[PDB]
Design an enzyme around this catalytic site. Structure first.
Site, PDB file in Angstrom:
ATOM      1  N   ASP A 175       0.848  -1.166   0.000  1.00  0.00           N
ATOM      2  CA  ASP A 175       0.000   0.000   0.000  1.00  0.00           C
ATOM      3  C   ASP A 175       0.890   1.224   0.000  1.00  0.00           C
ATOM      4  O   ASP A 175       2.095   1.113  -0.236  1.00  0.00           O
ATOM      5  CB  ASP A 175      -0.979  -0.015   1.175  1.00  0.00           C
ATOM      6  CG  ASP A 175      -2.284   0.691   0.853  1.00  0.00           C
ATOM      7  OD1 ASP A 175      -2.261   1.928   0.728  1.00  0.00           O
ATOM      8  OD2 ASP A 175      -3.336   0.016   0.732  1.00  0.00           O
ATOM      9  N   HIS A 246      -2.707   3.300  -4.478  1.00  0.00           N
ATOM     10  CA  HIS A 246      -2.093   2.778  -3.244  1.00  0.00           C
ATOM     11  C   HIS A 246      -0.656   2.336  -3.466  1.00  0.00           C
ATOM     12  O   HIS A 246      -0.236   1.325  -2.958  1.00  0.00           O
ATOM     13  CB  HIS A 246      -2.920   1.616  -2.677  1.00  0.00           C
ATOM     14  CG  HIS A 246      -4.289   2.025  -2.246  1.00  0.00           C
ATOM     15  ND1 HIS A 246      -5.355   2.088  -3.119  1.00  0.00           N
ATOM     16  CD2 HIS A 246      -4.755   2.458  -1.051  1.00  0.00           C
ATOM     17  CE1 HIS A 246      -6.426   2.515  -2.472  1.00  0.00           C
ATOM     18  NE2 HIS A 246      -6.087   2.749  -1.217  1.00  0.00           N
ATOM     19  N   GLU A 309      -9.736   2.971  -5.818  1.00  0.00           N
ATOM     20  CA  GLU A 309      -9.347   4.322  -5.407  1.00  0.00           C
ATOM     21  C   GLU A 309      -8.164   4.939  -6.159  1.00  0.00           C
ATOM     22  O   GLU A 309      -7.106   5.187  -5.570  1.00  0.00           O
ATOM     23  CB  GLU A 309      -9.105   4.354  -3.889  1.00  0.00           C
ATOM     24  CG  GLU A 309     -10.171   3.582  -3.105  1.00  0.00           C
ATOM     25  CD  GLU A 309     -10.140   3.829  -1.600  1.00  0.00           C
ATOM     26  OE1 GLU A 309      -9.138   4.375  -1.087  1.00  0.00           O
ATOM     27  OE2 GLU A 309     -11.133   3.471  -0.927  1.00  0.00           O
ATOM     28  N   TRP A 370     -17.555  -4.211  -2.654  1.00  0.00           N
ATOM     29  CA  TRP A 370     -17.744  -3.465  -1.416  1.00  0.00           C
ATOM     30  C   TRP A 370     -18.977  -2.554  -1.452  1.00  0.00           C
ATOM     31  O   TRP A 370     -19.385  -2.006  -0.425  1.00  0.00           O
ATOM     32  CB  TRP A 370     -16.494  -2.642  -1.128  1.00  0.00           C
ATOM     33  CG  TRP A 370     -16.053  -1.866  -2.305  1.00  0.00           C
ATOM     34  CD1 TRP A 370     -15.174  -2.263  -3.269  1.00  0.00           C
ATOM     35  CD2 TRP A 370     -16.486  -0.554  -2.668  1.00  0.00           C
ATOM     36  NE1 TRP A 370     -15.025  -1.272  -4.210  1.00  0.00           N
ATOM     37  CE2 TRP A 370     -15.823  -0.212  -3.864  1.00  0.00           C
ATOM     38  CE3 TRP A 370     -17.370   0.366  -2.097  1.00  0.00           C
ATOM     39  CZ2 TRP A 370     -16.016   1.009  -4.498  1.00  0.00           C
ATOM     40  CZ3 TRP A 370     -17.558   1.578  -2.726  1.00  0.00           C
ATOM     41  CH2 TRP A 370     -16.887   1.889  -3.916  1.00  0.00           C
ATOM     42  N   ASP A 397     -12.753  -3.159  10.654  1.00  0.00           N
ATOM     43  CA  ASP A 397     -12.075  -2.010  11.235  1.00  0.00           C
ATOM     44  C   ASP A 397     -13.111  -1.010  11.771  1.00  0.00           C
ATOM     45  O   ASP A 397     -12.772  -0.096  12.516  1.00  0.00           O
ATOM     46  CB  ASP A 397     -11.110  -1.353  10.231  1.00  0.00           C
ATOM     47  CG  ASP A 397     -11.784  -0.973   8.903  1.00  0.00           C
ATOM     48  OD1 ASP A 397     -11.542   0.159   8.423  1.00  0.00           O
ATOM     49  OD2 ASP A 397     -12.533  -1.802   8.322  1.00  0.00           O
ATOM     50  N   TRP A 442      -9.094  -3.696   7.955  1.00  0.00           N
ATOM     51  CA  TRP A 442      -8.100  -2.717   7.529  1.00  0.00           C
ATOM     52  C   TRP A 442      -7.347  -2.252   8.759  1.00  0.00           C
ATOM     53  O   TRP A 442      -7.948  -2.006   9.795  1.00  0.00           O
ATOM     54  CB  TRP A 442      -8.756  -1.551   6.805  1.00  0.00           C
ATOM     55  CG  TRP A 442      -9.484  -2.007   5.580  1.00  0.00           C
ATOM     56  CD1 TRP A 442     -10.825  -2.221   5.457  1.00  0.00           C
ATOM     57  CD2 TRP A 442      -8.905  -2.354   4.319  1.00  0.00           C
ATOM     58  NE1 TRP A 442     -11.115  -2.668   4.203  1.00  0.00           N
ATOM     59  CE2 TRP A 442      -9.954  -2.755   3.477  1.00  0.00           C
ATOM     60  CE3 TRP A 442      -7.599  -2.345   3.815  1.00  0.00           C
ATOM     61  CZ2 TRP A 442      -9.747  -3.144   2.152  1.00  0.00           C
ATOM     62  CZ3 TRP A 442      -7.387  -2.736   2.507  1.00  0.00           C
ATOM     63  CH2 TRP A 442      -8.459  -3.131   1.688  1.00  0.00           C
TER      64      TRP A 442
END
Lengths: 525, 525
Positions: A175, A246, A309, A370, A397, A442
């Site tokens: 990441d 990422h 993302e 997701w 998380d 996460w």
């Protein structure tokens, strides 16, 4: 007392007989050739807990018999308690799961690594169990990129997974904030990419930092071990190297992979990075070389490329990106995303692997959705295989209760009961098929394996039931009595510090550390 | 190549034969009745690493034979490589140590928990080894009072200890900053005493705090497990409940135990506490009740009472302490220290246990001497049994090099070579006997199991040799070649992140965190 059991996940059918069969230190373990694998695991686990020899005997002749029954599904088993303990299965994995159900039947001391009891005799209540998985893909994702988890803790997390009959571990290895996998051709990935100067304390929105270096990485031998350890427990390890976004850890190591800046360093904060790969032949070659080593280490039929993302800001302002989109004849610079991942997906295909992504490929492409039910059915329409991991349901998380007493609260309130009542797309007959579901952990805010345990449990226990058991027999209040009655004691025995039902223990709290609280309904309107 | 081996600790005598004996997946393990214990451990460890069955066979008939030889010492073994692998020992512990030497002979992959190699065949070079311990008590102390170590990590630390042939684990369970042991009669010990609000960051002398709650505890079942786990590996676990000083955690839980204050809370800082037990019948009764449960959990012939570092300030100002000293006819209030520990030592004696203390009792009293050779010989003159753990030699919380790049530097510079060249009191024939030596790891600054590993290793590897091997064959430069050549790879295989020889990895550093640097010579003059 005929329908009563405390097993989690609850088996599909259960009947209690009368009495208890006693196992002495002379108990022997037989198996058919296909099941010798599970025989070894049981021998190791139960031997450790009882101090018994558990020597092999001819299969039909033994105290604990693992027998092949080709009429059962591979992950399915039957468990019979009689003059002997007889576990029938369609395959190794089935026999393995039967073994786990056995350990639960013997009680929590059976999960210790050394005997905590007398060991004069143990007793298994006489029962008949018939069991299969509801979903074939029952996952958990573990983010080791944000906080590196030492190898000792990873294997322990994996052991706890197998006990819940979870078969997939999605390992998020890289990441912005670190790169955990040693690559022989590109030593700086670990030398540079495997550590950062400091870390955001709480939500990145509070703009406060802890002054504490963080890092580490797995060597190839370490990963091999983890893969072998998981395989002994019938868990598939899907590695993820997230691209094109990422990527700041890889860019720090090898700056050519980025657009440009002062030298780029491993990211010290959370959230979404505008700094991403410069998509180009050189990036492509780099990551084909990375995926060559990955594929040598991880046998898994899927390999995850991420794809989540990516802001287009960098690409829109990039003379190189513009040029590239022209050469390919793309409509705009944003098409490079689809193109880049596809080229890598093609390279994986060359190696015989399907690709896994978070959204938006060759035939065996797996989408991890997701978004809600809509994004999921949409990916089935297009023929992509799907696994559900809704952000508003399955993200661990996220805070387990409303209010200020939960540590570093972020995301939606996702509770034990809410998670237990969850469903995956509840006669359209599309080309894509639903493989199963997955829970994601996460690690931004979980800075020790203790914190990861707090996040994952008890919720992951309820989730394991949702993935394994029969949806017809589902009642939360009933589940609780099994959880509190037996299972919490099993988690304690395996070294798992969970969130107590009444809320965090004082040493589990983290006051003064700002989270970010989300409300699902507010975000819709 | 006849005198060449990479084993650590180095065995007493070693000779290489010619060639390699190959072990296939059919390799069977025999043992004499006394050694069935070690057979089980090997089966579990090596089976895990190879995927082999390792089924038992009659002892004389087997690929790996563990044979009883009454003419050898109990901790001593002989290892012979031939048409078969033959390990002779005087007892279980001996056979166990032979097993460890075997694993080292097979290579680092033999220490993994799942196979990282082909497993078509493994090879053991043909050798003859004859081995015994130099010291009978080879210790390590682990402070879990300052930073709680999760159970998973404790068992792993213990596994690494047994691999170095260390037989004693001194478990420091309680202190000012927390109380780790659950006591059924006194629930607040854990409810209150098992956690603190925050922690000093760096030396207490910098007066800065981390704002982060810390805590946890072992249940009785957890301790049992740890004791059983250690016993399978032939490690004795000596628990310590430190009294009359280092008691603020117990005082927080049950304030009656102290003089008085706003309510007393678990201490949040390091160093020496002026707040100590009020010695009295009630304190005495409390701690007899505690030692009743301790003695039920821990089978160990010694139980540690501490006794270190009690300032007399409180007692000198105490009307109660003054009264008490009169009733007993003591010269002054400082005699209550000797009296209090003695009463508890008497209670232990009632239970058949000898007492262990740091200084200054019934016959089997063991002194752990942190002073130099003088304090040690002095305790022998008085007939006390002694184990050496000099503060300026064997304390592993102390910095491993001079300068500002070591994390939270404190204590004297204690290096790998210095520690390897250490000796315990090198014909006075006194009543006290020297049992051995021990290395101490104090946890004030080690806030994760990773940090503990950094502190303990590589030094503890060199120390294990000092405790086990023959002092005649000692050369540091030679040792290094074995360390770097083989052993570091073994530590990597066991999940141990050590201090690299060239200094801390960037993620192991902790800049901005003030230590306290000591110089041994400066403190003498």
């Amino acid at each position: 007392m005929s329908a009563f059991h405390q097993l989690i996940p609850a088996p599909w059918s259960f009947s209690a007989g009368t009495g208890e069969l006693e196992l002495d230190a002379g108990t022997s373990v037989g198996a058919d050739p296909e099941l010798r694998g599970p025989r070894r695991w049981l021998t190791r686990a139960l031997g450790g807990a009882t101090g018994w020899d558990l020597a092999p005997a001819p299969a039909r002749e033994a105290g604990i018999r693992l027998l092949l029954d080709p009429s059962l599904d591979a992950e399915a088993y039957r468990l019979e308690v009689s003059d002997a303990v007889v576990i029938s299965a369609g395959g190794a994995a089935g026999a393995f799961y039967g073994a786990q159900t056995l350990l639960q039947l013997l009680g929590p001391a059976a999960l210790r690594q050394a005997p905590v009891v007398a060991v004069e005799g143990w007793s298994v209540p006489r029962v008949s169990v018939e069991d299969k998985p509801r979903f074939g893909y029952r996952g958990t994702m573990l983010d080791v990129a944000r906080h590196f988890m030492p190898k000792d803790n990873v294997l322990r997390f994996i052991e706890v997974m197998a006990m819940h009959k979870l078969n997939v571990l999605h390992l998020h290895l890289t990441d912005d904030q670190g790169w955990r996998m040693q690559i022989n051709r590109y030593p700086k990935l670990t030398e540079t990419g495997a550590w950062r100067r400091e870390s955001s304390l709480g939500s990145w929105r509070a703009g406060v930092f802890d002054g504490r270096p963080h890092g580490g990485f797995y060597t190839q031998d370490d990963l091999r071990e983890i893969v072998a350890f998981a395989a002994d427990r019938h868990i598939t390890v899907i590695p993820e190297i997230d691209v094109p976004g990422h990527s700041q850890a890889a860019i720090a190591a090898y700056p050519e992979l980025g657009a440009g800046p002062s030298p780029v360093e491993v990211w010290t904060r959370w959230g979404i990075n505008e700094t991403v790969l410069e998509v180009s032949e050189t990036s492509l070659e780099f990551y084909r070389n990375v995926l060559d080593e990955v594929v040598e280490i991880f046998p898994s039929p899927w390999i995850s490329l991420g794809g989540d993302e990516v802001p287009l800001t960098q690409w829109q302002a990039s003379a190189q990106a513009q040029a590239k989109a022209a050469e390919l004849g793309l409509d705009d610079v944003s098409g490079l995303h689809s193109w880049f991942v596809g080229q890598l997906a093609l390279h994986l295909k060359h190696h015989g692997r399907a690709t896994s992504v978070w959204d938006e490929l060759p035939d065996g492409a797996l989408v991890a959705s997701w978004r809600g039910y809509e994004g999921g059915i949409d990916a089935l329409r297009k023929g992509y295989d799907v696994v559900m991991c809704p952000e508003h349901k399955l993200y661990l998380d996220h805070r387990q209760a409303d209010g200020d007493d939960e540590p570093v609260p972020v995301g939606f309130v996702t509770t034990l009961q809410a998670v237990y009542e969850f469903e995956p797309l509840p006669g359209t007959d599309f080309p894509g098929r639903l493989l199963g579901a997955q829970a994601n952990i996460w690690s931004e805010h979980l800075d020790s394996p203790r914190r990861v345990q707090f996040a994952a449990f008890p919720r992951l226990s309820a989730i394991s039931e949702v993935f394994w058991s029969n949806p017809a027999g589902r009642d939360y209040d009933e589940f609780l009595t099994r959880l509190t009655g037996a299972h919490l004691a099993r988690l304690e025995a395996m070294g798992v510090e969970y969130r107590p039902l009444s809320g965090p223990a004082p040493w589990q709290q983290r006051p003064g550390v700002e989270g970010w609280k989300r409300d699902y309904d507010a975000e819709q309107l």
